[PDB]
Amino acid sequence: PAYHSSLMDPDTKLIGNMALLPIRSQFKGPAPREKDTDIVDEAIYYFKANVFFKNYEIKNEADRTLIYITLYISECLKKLQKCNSKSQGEKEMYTLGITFPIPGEPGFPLNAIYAKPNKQEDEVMRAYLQQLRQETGLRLCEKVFDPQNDKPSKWWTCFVKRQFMNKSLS
Amino acid sequence: ATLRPYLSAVRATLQAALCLENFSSQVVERHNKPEVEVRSSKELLLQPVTISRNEKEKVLIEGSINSVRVSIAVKQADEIEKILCHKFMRFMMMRAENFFILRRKPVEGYDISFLITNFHTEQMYKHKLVDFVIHFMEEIDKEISEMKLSVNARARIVAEEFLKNF
Amino acid sequence: QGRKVVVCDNGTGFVKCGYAGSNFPEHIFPALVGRPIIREIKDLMVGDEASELRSMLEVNYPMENGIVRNWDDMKHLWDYTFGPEKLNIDTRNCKILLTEPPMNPTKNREKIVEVMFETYQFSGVYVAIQAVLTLYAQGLLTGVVVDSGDGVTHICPVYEGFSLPHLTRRLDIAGRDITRYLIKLLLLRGYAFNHSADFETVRMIKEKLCYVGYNIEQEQKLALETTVLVESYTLPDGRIIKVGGERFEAPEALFQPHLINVEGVGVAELLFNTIQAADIDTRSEFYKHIVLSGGSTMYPGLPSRLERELKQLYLERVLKGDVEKLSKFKIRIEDPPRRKHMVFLGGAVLADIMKDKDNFWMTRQEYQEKGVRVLEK
Amino acid sequence: MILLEVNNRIIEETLALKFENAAAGNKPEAVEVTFADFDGVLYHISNPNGDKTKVMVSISLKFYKELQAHGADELLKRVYGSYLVNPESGYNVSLLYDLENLPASKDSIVHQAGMLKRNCFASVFEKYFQFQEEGKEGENRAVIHYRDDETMYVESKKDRVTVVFSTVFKDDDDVVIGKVFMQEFKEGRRASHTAPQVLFSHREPPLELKDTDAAVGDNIGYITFVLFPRHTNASARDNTINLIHTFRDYLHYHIKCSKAYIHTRMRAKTSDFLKVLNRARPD
Amino acid sequence: GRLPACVVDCGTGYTKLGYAGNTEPQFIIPSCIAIKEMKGVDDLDFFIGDEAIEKPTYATKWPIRHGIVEDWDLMERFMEQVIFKYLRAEPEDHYFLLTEPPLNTPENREYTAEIMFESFNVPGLYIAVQAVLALAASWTSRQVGERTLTGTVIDSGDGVTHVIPVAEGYVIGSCIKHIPIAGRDITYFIQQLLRDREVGIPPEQSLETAKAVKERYSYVCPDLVKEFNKYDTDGSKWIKQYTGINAISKKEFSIDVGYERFLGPEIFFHPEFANPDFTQPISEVVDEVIQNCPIDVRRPLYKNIVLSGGSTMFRDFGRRLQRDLKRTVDARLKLSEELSGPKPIDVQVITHHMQRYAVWFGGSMLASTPEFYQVCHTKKDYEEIGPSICRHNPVFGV
Amino acid sequence: DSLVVCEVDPELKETLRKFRFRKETNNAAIIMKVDKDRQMVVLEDELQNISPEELKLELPERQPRFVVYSYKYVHDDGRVSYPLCFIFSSPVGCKPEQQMMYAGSKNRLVQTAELTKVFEIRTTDDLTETWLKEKLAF
Amino acid sequence: MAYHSFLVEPISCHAWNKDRTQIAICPNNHEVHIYEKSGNKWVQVHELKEHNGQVTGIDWAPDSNRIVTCGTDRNAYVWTLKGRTWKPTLVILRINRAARCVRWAPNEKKFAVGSGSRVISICYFEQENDWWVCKHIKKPIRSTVLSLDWHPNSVLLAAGSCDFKCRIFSAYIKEVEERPAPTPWGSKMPFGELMFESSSSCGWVHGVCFSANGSRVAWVSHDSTVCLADADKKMAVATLASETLPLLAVTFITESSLVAAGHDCFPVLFTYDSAAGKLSFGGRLDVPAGLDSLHKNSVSQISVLSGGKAKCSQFCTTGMDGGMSIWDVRSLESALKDLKIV
Amino acid sequence: ARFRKVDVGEYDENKFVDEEGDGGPDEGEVDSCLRQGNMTAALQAALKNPPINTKSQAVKDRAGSIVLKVLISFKANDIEKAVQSLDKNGVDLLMKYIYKGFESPSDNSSAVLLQWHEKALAAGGVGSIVRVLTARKTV
Ligand SMILES: Nc1ncnc2c1ncn2[C@@H]1O[C@H](COP(=O)(O)OP(=O)(O)OP(=O)(O)O)[C@@H](O)[C@H]1O
Ligand SMILES: [Ca+2]
Ligand SMILES: [Ca+2]
């Protein structure tokens, strides 16, 4: 079946019911310092497979973070499809970070599975999802664009219409 | 020419013959059988009667307290009509589980026989069944005429299609 | 006090238990004891539960042909009958009447008395011969009991209360074998059934639709010349099938054992041959005291067919063909409406009318004092 | 399909496939095929001694010895020549085709390969067509036992050439259907004034084939084709042989097809009766 | 006698027909028939197989739906040309072997026989159950060791994928499960992936190409992500190229063939990829069927899982199934240890050379033997006893 | 084997004693009943000058009854006996409970009475002089 | 003209309770359904599931409020309403073929069951054993008994059979009732005595009925005739041959008027002119699938809802069409003005 | 032995048997009406003294022939008046003779019979036919 996150550490804090997993990013936010592999690398390595699956059992909190990034990866591809350069893809992945609803608000069409945020849990959730959106968008820009040259690769653009669990952030 | 008076007669006879009711065997414990088939209780058989249109086309009706057996001698003008009739009656008899009232083999010396139990007159309208048997008698005569013309017609075409090529 | 009695006919197929003075058995369920193969399933399953999950348990019948083969599993089955899920009784404050099947070894007969007093500690126990109960239940002491159940069919001469071991014959054809045969017939009709997997589904088709033909040549003429025998039947999976002449062909195995490769004569010829090997004076008295019992005697037409078949035999091989003397042939094959569980019905009545007596019930006092047995016949 | 095809499809597709692969220079494929034709014919396509570059097509007819008597070998020598070799064990005629050494136009040899059975039959007609042409009247008639219990009699005359089939109807219903088909052949020159004449007899043979053992029967019938110079000449010779020798099977084909159409009629009406019955229910 | 029996396997997509004795069918034609959009001989104006697919003025009709015959008029006409055009068998001189789907009603058996005997006058008929013929075809690769008719059969074709348990030649009909994934569904899903990614394929030949990618380039992978990883890591070594011919312009067109290579056959193991109404992987379906069968026949069924049909021809299909099935059965059978207190269950999926046409091949071998003529129903019996006899065709061959 | 569902009344004991050595030489009969509340076999009636057909009519058709019949049997030889026939009338339609009390009490009554000519009928219609004499031939 | 379709299969038989609030029917199977009326609607209140074959007769003892049933499984049950539930008591009929019809006597102390055993079973309750006893009337019955009706004295009992005869028997059971006072039918009425037998030698006798005062018996046969004998005129037999299809059910509505129904599917009136000694056809009572009658299939039973068989004002018909119709005789007399009862 | 085939049901004492070949129409009687042209009188003559009670098949056939002759001699339009002359019992009897006439059809005696059946049916209703089937002693 589908692919789950195997980075579930004994001392991993939460945010809602998502795991607050560290990332190795240059964007500022409420993530811990991150050696090589993290939840965003795990999400991209797994993306092309998971996106076909409709059903998904949630083994632990780390999977809810994995799901979110997977869904967002599809939102990047929708926007990357029209771009004319790896540089322009970065402009709009910055824009796609700055632009979406959270667990509780009109979905985020998964309010059944995710948990709601008080003041402190709410402002941190906004900012952690933002840091995921900004770092995921950045790494995708390297992966999606072909250097011969500056068009998006059809091997990432062919996934643009496929929806993970038939859910979408747009 | 003499079809319509003959059917009107067969109808009224069926109308009297299909006055059935459910009837438990008085011979075998907790059994239920069409008495016209088993014939083991003589007081329960009604007098057999024939209606005949001529020497070749007739109907025999065998009534009983819970079952009726209509058997039909069909018009068969010539050998080709005979074999079409036999092919066709055989075809419908093979399908006799779908006709709930059709008998798998005809009474000896007839082409096709119906066996209508009290269970059929209970779950269908008895006057519609009568309508059906009269309907059936008409239509198998039409259908044999169709099939007879059909064979003649394709015989012509097959003879020409071969000969026009010499 | 007062109370409290209980009764138990341990069938090969089905356990029928209830209370003295019951008119139907208060519980009927398969005589079954299934262990699981893998990890609300318990370490063991009995009766209804065990039949329900039968595709997941290695299942055992401790009764083979009316006799106990496995005393271990038999204990579990008795724990189930008495235990909460059925009777919920304290065995120690109860009397109990059991039935013993034909030609049971006294080894077994003993061991149960031993089991009942040692392992369950009933205050009162009694053991009745089936054939004698079924006759006592109808105001009879002499006579012939035809018991056809699940495993085997027994023909049991009884004389003034005593069963006769050396005139009691068996036919290794009954309920299971007919269900099994009907599967074969539905197979030849073109339905891909399985003898194991679909035994229960076809058993219910048999119970629901099969009957015994009175005149087989005539039933075959109906089967072959009409569709009046044909019936739809909806299977568990939803599929509908047609059952026709196989309705009477399946139970015909009772009268014609060769139809399922079984040596012997078939119940009517067997019954005739057995009655005929007795005293001239007791022959008369047997022929007018034939009694049916058990589940496989419920097929519509069965008693008529037995009557007819005995007359044909007596005419051909006793009256040597002349029908003028047939009229004198007195013959009674009584088929009570409650004949399916006569052994229980008889035992329930007897355990009731004998409940508050003293010399009847063999006591725990007696067996400890001792010992097995403790029989007073 | 009204007219039955003359050529064998299994021979042609086997060879066309094989020859297409040789013309590309692909690896020679192994082959072993055992199949039939009408009139008890048995074919066999194979590689002799496992040699996969060579493809042998053999044919076996139980009445070849009779065709051989009427110039079968010399006709087959014309048509195939180099391709024709010694017959395989059990068969009468074998063709051999070298995949390393084939013609440019592949379609020519493949067409003639598919006409092996036909070309076996053809000799006996060409023989009698020219008896009539040259005017050699009063020759022996030919008797070909193309089936075990059926016989073709070919006979040359002053002005005409007669071909008589003595065919059998196993099923008794087929006799009566065949009778109706034959009746239209007998009144068949209403369509074509120029076509051959066709005579029919139900049990006993014509005045010609009477006797030297012509089997009389209730399930037998004698169809006689009276061909003329117009049909037997060199310009229309091959066409006539192609029709005339498939005639028996064309007749039986159409009897069986005729019965299959009767079925679709019977399904229609039976289906209607069942609807009418079902409308007799309260629902 | 002298000349071999005719053998016909009629499937949803393809009819395979030829003479008994042969290893492969003489023709494999599409199971369609083209007809007019009536008296005379208009019933005869039709075509079947390939010459019927795109016929200008004719309607192509598919009389066999999901294995089972829908239209008997058209099935009968299809038979006319099978016998007289393609086989060129004098039908009166040949016994016939016809196949039936797993869920074929006994009424259908009669309708079939009626055609063969009443129309074509065949001297003998045998309606074979397909699962039994596949089992026999796999005896070519066992080989003499345990050649038996007890085993689980995966028949996968164009229409329907079934899982059919068989016990001594007798199908266990109550435990048959089917899967909504078949050939056509894979072709359709592969065609989908190509439109999303590739261009240059002429719309007319989108299925044609998808079929060719399916049959010539596709395979079953051990793990999905690792394959996606190979393709993104290497790319040059896993992305193959296919070039077809444009049917109108006759010049070549060529495309990349990538992810669909392994994704297409994956839908057997993750049907949810192309199927909303079904999610259960084939490995689980096979396990479930065998667990529904009787205790004392499961181990035999497990060790003889025979593959039949064209949609089982994918590379590594058998090995993938065996592995996923052994993971389920061993993981389950380890708890029975850790919750106590079982013999290691031997699982074997059989791949063999005759898979593509398993059914037909088995049928050809059966019809070659002497005992086939002994278990065939004759016309004499069909007439004297009646059509009932064709409801049960005796199993034999062990 | 060892069943005495109902015992035999001490008074009935005697009646059967005296009847066993009866000096009178006509046809006579004692008819006996099972008392439900007392659970004992008791006397119902004593009747004198009765043919087999007349005794038949005295019996309940749909209730079991025990009978002891002193019947003057004229043998095939011509010379005469007064055998004490015991007859168990056990009709078919009767209460199961009632049948069990009769069936279970018969053997105790028969040894108590010390009779050896023991018969049983399913219907009173069977109790005739041909039937009684047929059985006595043994 | 008050038709209600309870179902679409037959109603085999039916019975009404005393005050006609509830109707019991067998919907062509092994069970009996009891429907109570609630305002406009009929509502099912009870299922009586004990028979193991089709139920052929149902009768409701009005004062004792006990239902008796008989079926093809050879059995009969007396049903007794215990609290909220009808509980059944098996009656040993001792018959070896199916039961066919069952009617309590007026006195409610016993019921009669006709069967295919060529015998009538007369059952009464034995107070000491708490047990249903039953005696058989055998001769001269030579076939199945299809119908029964009691004389008002609860002793004489009419029967119609497939041997083509209507008979009157004495079902006198000394252990439950006073000896009967003599009737025009006769003075000697021991159990089983044959008081009268019809002279018809053909036509199965489908229904039979006694008059209100019991002097006259009327029956209908399968030769499309209706007949009547009055013991006042030395058992003289009045006969009438019908132009239409056989009748299956009959009842007196006055001492000299009859209502009958059968395979035509509508009720018809017959008047008996005592003086001229002849039966007269009073005409069709049901006046307007394709059928013009209320019932769309044969009427199998007809029963008097009120006024008894002396002055019947309402009567009931059940038929093979699964319909039950109520007929008000005053309403019928308003519609057909040229219609004369008595 | 196969003792099973012997039909023991033949010797059942309870089984039903029909009660009663005790003591036709007159030839010259009918031919006096027939030569005269009085067809209605000829019909009323042939319906006298039907051999219902004899078991002799011959005398029943004798009677059938005689009744059939009258019906054949009629002209189509004349039939209706002759049938309406008969009382209900004559009409019911005519049916019995008509149904017997159907068993022996030629000379377009069958064509006229069907018309006789039509008038008979109007007169006596379907019940006149019911009494043909129901009758145990018949013509
Ligand atoms: N109505 C019925 N008709 C026919 N067969 C039945 C019917 N009801 C039950 N059976 C069959 O009879 C058998 C049950 O009868 P019963 O309970 O007397 O057997 P048992 O007591 O379990 O076995 P045994 O009598 O061998 O000890 C089963 O095999 C069942 O299929
Ligand atoms: Ca038992
Ligand atoms: Ca297939």
Residues from chain G contacting residue H137 (CB–CB below 8 Å) = 201-202
d(CA E253, CA E238): 20
d(CA G176, CA C136): 30
Backbone region of residue C103 per phi and psi (left: phi > 0; alpha: psi in -120 to 50; beta: other values): left
d(CA G79, CA G9): 25
Amino acid found at G145: V
Q: Which residue has the tokens 């057996």?
A: B69
| CB C25 less than 6 A from any atom of ligand 1 | no
Residue ranges of chain C that CATH labels 3.30.420.40: 1-129+339-377, 130-173+263-338
Q: Cα-flanking dihedrals φ and ψ of residue E81, to 5°?
A: -80, -35
Cβ atoms within 10 Å of G37's Cβ, excluding its own: 13
CB nearest to C197's CB, from E174, E336, E340: E174
Backbone region of residue B148 per phi and psi (left: phi > 0; alpha: psi in -120 to 50; beta: other values): alpha
- 3-state SS string over C120-179? HCCCEEEEEEHHHHHHHCCCCCCEEEEEECCCCEEEEEEECCEECHHHCEEECCCHHHHH
CB nearest to B46's CB, from H102, H118, H133: H133
d(CA D54, CA D101): 10
Compare all CA atoms of chain B with the CA of E114 and give the residue at the minimum distance: B91
| CB C12 less than 6 A from any atom of ligand 1 | yes
Distance from residue E357's CA to the centre of ligand 3 (Å): 8
- DSSP, collapsed to helix, strand or coil, labels residue G239 as strand
Rounded to 5°, angle at Cα A57 from A54 and A58: 125
Residue among E162, E138, E155, E171 nearest E304 (CA) = E138
Amino acid found at C63: M
Sign of the alpha-carbon dihedral angle for E181, E185, E186, E192: negative
Sign of the alpha-carbon dihedral angle for E223, E229, E232, E238: negative
* DSSP of G128-139: TTTEEEEEEE-T
Beta bridge mates, D199: D224
| Tokens of residue B42, six digits | 């003589």
Q: Cα-flanking dihedrals φ and ψ of residue A29, to 5°?
A: 170, -175
CATH of span C174-262: 3.90.640.10
Structural contact between residues C104 and C66, judged by C-beta atoms closer than 8 angstroms: yes
Q: Which CATH class is domain C1-129+339-377?
A: alpha beta
d(CA G246, CA G222): 5
Please tell me the total count of domains within chain H: 1
Rg (CA), chain F: 15
Compare all CA atoms of chain E with the CA of D14 and give the residue at the minimum distance: E26
DSSP H or E stretch at residue A91: helix A86-98
d(CA G122, CA G76): 12
How many C-alpha atoms does H61 have within 13 Å on its Cβ side? 5
* DSSP of C93-117: G-EEEEEE-TT--HHHHHHHHHHII
Cβ atoms within 10 Å of B72's Cβ, excluding its own: 21
Structural contact between residues E75 and E100, judged by C-beta atoms closer than 8 angstroms: no
Structural contact between residues C270 and C198, judged by C-beta atoms closer than 8 angstroms: no
Residues 6+ apart with CB under 8 A from G116: B24, B25, B26, G97, G98, G100, G144, G145
Task: Provide the strand spans (E) within F9-126.
Answer: 28-35, 40-48, 65-70, 73-74, 80-81, 84-89, 117-121
Q: Is G216 exposed, middle or buried (0-12, 13-18, 19+ CB in 10 A)?
A: buried
**For ligand 1, atom 30, which residue shows the shortest CA distance?**
C175
**For ligand 1, atom 25, which residue shows the shortest CA distance?**
C149
The Cα of B99 is separated from the nearest Cα of chain D by a number of Å equal to 6
d(CA G168, CA G197): 7
Structural contact between residues G280 and G240, judged by C-beta atoms closer than 8 angstroms: yes
**For ligand 1, atom 20, which residue shows the shortest CA distance?**
C11
DSSP letter (8 states) at residue A118: -
Domains of chain A: 1-170 (1.10.1760.10)
d(CA G168, CA G180): 15
Structural contact between residues C191 and C211, judged by C-beta atoms closer than 8 angstroms: no
Map out the domains of chain F as residue ranges. Answer: 1-138
DSSP letter (8 states) at residue F71: -
How many C-alpha atoms does D21 have within 13 Å on its Cβ side? 16
- 3-state SS string over chain E? CCCCCEEEEECCCEEEEEECCCCCCCEEEECCEEECCCCCCCCCCCEEHHHHCCCCCCEEECCEECCEECCHHHHHHHHHHHHHHHHCCCHHHCCEEEEECCCCCHHHHHHHHHHHHHHCCCCEEEEEEHHHHHHHHHHHHCCCCCCCCCEEEEEECCCCEEEEEEECCEECHHHCEEECCCHHHHHHHHHHHHHHHCCCCCHHHHHHHHHHHHHHHCECCCCHHHHHHHHHHCCCCCCEEEEEECCCCCCEEEEEECCHHHHHHHCCCCHHHCCCCCCCCHHHHHHHHHHHCCHHHHHHHHCCEEEECHHHCCECHHHHHHHHHHHHHHHHHHHHHHCCCCCCCCCCEECCHHHCCHHHHHHHHHHHCCHHHHHCEEHHHHHHCCHHHHHCCCCCCC
CB contact (8 A) between residue F95 and residue G129: yes
Rounded to 5°, angle at Cα A102 from A97 and A104: 170
How do strand C153-159 and strand C162-163 relate by DSSP bridges? antiparallel
The Cα of C301 is separated from the nearest Cα of chain B by a number of Å equal to 5
Give, as residue ranges, everything with CB less than 5 Å from ion ligand 2.
C 11, 149
* C-alpha G270, offset from chain centre: 17
Q: Is C166 exposed, middle or buried (0-12, 13-18, 19+ CB in 10 A)?
A: exposed
Q: Which ligand is nearest to the CA of C104?
A: 1
Q: Which ligand is nearest to the CA of E156?
A: 3
* DSSP of B84-142: HHHHHHHHHHHTTTTSTTB-SSPPTT-SEEEEEEHHHHHHS-HHHHHHHHHHHHHHHHH
- DSSP, collapsed to helix, strand or coil, labels residue C323 as coil
Residues 6+ apart with CB under 8 A from D8: D37, D43, D114, D115, D116, D117, E88
How do strand C362-363 and strand G278-284 relate by DSSP bridges? unpaired
DSSP letter (8 states) at residue H77: G
* C-alpha G146, offset from chain centre: 10
**For ligand 1, atom 15, which residue shows the shortest CA distance?**
C295
How large is the greatest C-alpha to C-alpha distance in chain D, in angstroms?
82
Burial F9-19 (b: 16+ CB within 10 A, else e): beebeebbeeb
Structural contact between residues G266 and G281, judged by C-beta atoms closer than 8 angstroms: no
d(CA G146, CA B24): 11
Pocket test for ligand 1, best of C51, C64, C150 (most atoms within 8 A of CB): C150
Beta bridge mates, C363: C124
The Cα of D33 is separated from the nearest Cα of chain B by a number of Å equal to 32
CATH number at residue H75: 1.25.40.190
DSSP H or E stretch at residue C234: strand C231-234
| Tokens of residue G26, six digits | 């067998």
Distance from residue C137's CA to the centre of ligand 1 (Å): 19
Burial C50-72 (b: 16+ CB within 10 A, else e): bbeebebbebbbbbebbbbeeee
Integer angstrom CA distances of residue D107 from A77, D114, D237, E51: 56, 11, 22, 19
d(CA G260, CA G224): 11
Binding residues of C for ATP: 149-151, 203-207, 294-299
Instruction: Find which of C132, C353, C357, C361 to mutate to test the F interface (most F CBs within 10 Å of its CB).
Output: C353
Structural contact between residues A110 and A68, judged by C-beta atoms closer than 8 angstroms: no
Q: Which CATH class is domain B1-166?
A: alpha beta
d(CA G296, CA G323): 8
Please enumerate residues of E whose Cβ is less than 8 A from a Cβ of C: 105-106, 109, 129, 167, 170-175, 291-297, 332-333, 335-336, 338-340, 342, 391-392
DSSP H or E stretch at residue C8: strand C7-10
Structural contact between residues D250 and D3, judged by C-beta atoms closer than 8 angstroms: yes
Beta bridge mates, G41: G38
DSSP letter (8 states) at residue G186: B
The Cα of E48 is separated from the nearest Cα of chain B by a number of Å equal to 21
d(CA G182, CA G179): 9
Residues from chain H contacting residue C327 (CB–CB below 8 Å) = 11, 13
| Tokens of residue B100, six digits | 């709930």
Residues 6+ apart with CB under 8 A from E375: E126, E393, E394, E396
Integer angstrom CA distances of residue B56 from B53, B78, C198: 8, 12, 53
d(CA D195, CA C363): 112
Residues 6+ apart with CB under 8 A from H2: none
How do strand E59-61 and strand E33-35 relate by DSSP bridges? antiparallel
How do strand G323-328 and strand G2-5 relate by DSSP bridges? antiparallel
d(CA B153, CA E43): 13
Distance from residue C271's CA to the centre of ligand 1 (Å): 20
Instruction: Find which of D34, D170, D250 to mutate to test the E interface (most E CBs within 10 Å of its CB).
Output: D34
CATH-assigned architecture of domain D1-131: 2-Layer Sandwich (3.30)
| CB C294 less than 6 A from any atom of ligand 1 | yes
How do strand D32-37 and strand D41-46 relate by DSSP bridges? antiparallel
How do strand E124-129 and strand E96-100 relate by DSSP bridges? parallel
Compare all CA atoms of chain H with the CA of G201 and give the residue at the minimum distance: H136
Domains of chain E: 1-130+359-393 (3.30.420.40), 131-180+280-358 (3.30.420.40), 181-279 (3.90.640.10)
Q: Which ligand is nearest to the CA of C30?
A: 1
Residues from chain D contacting residue E38 (CB–CB below 8 Å) = none
Instruction: Find which of B23, B25, B29 to mutate to test the C interface (most C CBs within 10 Å of its CB).
Output: B29
Compare all CA atoms of chain B with the CA of E39 and give the residue at the minimum distance: B150
| Tokens of residue G306, six digits | 């009120």
| Tokens of residue E236, six digits | 């040059």
d(CA C34, CA G67): 46
| CB C177 less than 6 A from any atom of ligand 1 | no
d(CA F65, CA F99): 10
d(CA E55, CA E43): 16
CATH of span F1-138: 3.40.20.10
Determine the topology of domain C130-173+263-338 in CATH. Answer: Nucleotidyltransferase; domain 5 (3.30.420)
The Cα of G271 is separated from the nearest Cα of chain H by a number of Å equal to 19
| Tokens of residue E137, six digits | 């075809």
d(CA C10, CA C74): 10
Residue among E124, E11, E120, E134 nearest E69 (CA) = E11
CB contact (8 A) between residue H14 and residue G142: yes
Q: Which ligand is nearest to the CA of C173?
A: 1
Q: Cα-flanking dihedrals φ and ψ of residue E162, to 5°?
A: -110, 155
Q: Is D187 exposed, middle or buried (0-12, 13-18, 19+ CB in 10 A)?
A: exposed
Relative to the CA of C294, which ligand 1 atom is closest? 18
Residues 6+ apart with CB under 8 A from C312: H3, H4, H6, H8
Compare all CA atoms of chain G with the CA of C300 and give the residue at the minimum distance: G73
- DSSP, collapsed to helix, strand or coil, labels residue A3 as coil
d(CA G152, CA G170): 12
| Tokens of residue H36, six digits | 């005269």
Determine the topology of domain D133-283 in CATH. Answer: Yope Regulator; Chain: A, (3.30.1460)
Q: Would D1-131 and D133-283 be classified into the same CATH topology?
A: yes
- DSSP, collapsed to helix, strand or coil, labels residue G337 as coil
d(CA D162, CA D225): 6
**For ligand 1, atom 27, which residue shows the shortest CA distance?**
C11
DSSP letter (8 states) at residue C230: -
d(CA G248, CA G237): 19
